[PDB]
């Protein structure tokens, strides 16, 4: 149970801006 297991792959969130 690691809150990071669902936070590292946030590369898709970067493009969400542009």
Coordinates of C-alpha atoms in Angstrom, one line a residue, residues 1-2 4 7 9 11-12 15 17-18:
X1 CA 0.0 0.0 0.0
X2 CA 2.0 3.0 -1.2
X4 CA 3.3 6.7 -4.6
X7 CA 1.5 9.2 -8.3
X9 CA 3.2 8.0 -13.6
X11 CA 3.6 12.5 -16.9
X12 CA 0.1 12.6 -18.6
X15 CA 0.5 17.8 -21.0
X17 CA -1.9 22.0 -19.3
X18 CA -0.8 22.5 -22.9

